[PDB]
């Protein structure tokens, strides 16, 4: 699912898409992802933003 | 493909009302500086 | 020209009202741009 402005979204349709259902409730930091492209494919940025936002 | 007139509608719809308020704020501060009477009144 | 008008007033816009109006116009531009672009 595309969520960013450079992949064809606007302000309304754009989103940081949640993590993969294959991940589930598993912790997915960047260092558990073997490449950043795999981390970006599996919705890694959602877990980074949400956990830093809720702590913050 | 998006509507090409929307670039004018967004950018003039932003800049012209924003520069109107920048105009109103600046003449408010210039009127206060002229009434203050020193070095900025002239 | 007739006489100098006695109804002439000054106009104010303080810095708070500038920030409120700059925020309003930018946020309305953020909100309505996706619809204008369609």
């Amino acid at each position: 699912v595309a969520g960013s402005l450079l992949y064809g979204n606007n302000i309304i349709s754009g989103a940081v898409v949640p993590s993969s259902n294959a991940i589930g409730m598993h912790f997915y930091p960047i260092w558990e992802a073997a490449s950043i492209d795999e981390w970006l494919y599996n919705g890694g940025p959602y877990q980074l933003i949400v956990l830093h936002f809720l702590l913050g | 493909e998006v509507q090409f007139g929307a670039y004018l509608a967004v950018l003039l719809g932003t800049f012209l009302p924003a520069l109107f308020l920048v105009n109103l704020f600046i003449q408010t501060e210039a009127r206060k500086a002229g009434k203050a009477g020193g070095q900025d009144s002239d | 020209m007739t006489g100098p008008n006695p109804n002439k007033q000054a106009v104010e816009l303080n810095r708070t009202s500038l920030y409120w109006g700059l925020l309003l116009i930018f946020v309305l531009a953020v909100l309505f741009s996706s619809y204008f672009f369609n």
Partner: peptide
């Protein structure tokens, strides 16, 4: 190309928020 407009409006909105906080009119007594 419209993502240039979308980025400029969001970054321009955050610049207003920066100036509204750090270049605010300081509330003064008397």
């Amino acid at each position: 190309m419209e993502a240039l407009v979308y980025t400029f409006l969001l970054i321009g909105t955050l610049m207003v928020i920066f100036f509204a906080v750090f270049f605010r009119e300081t509330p003064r007594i008397l």
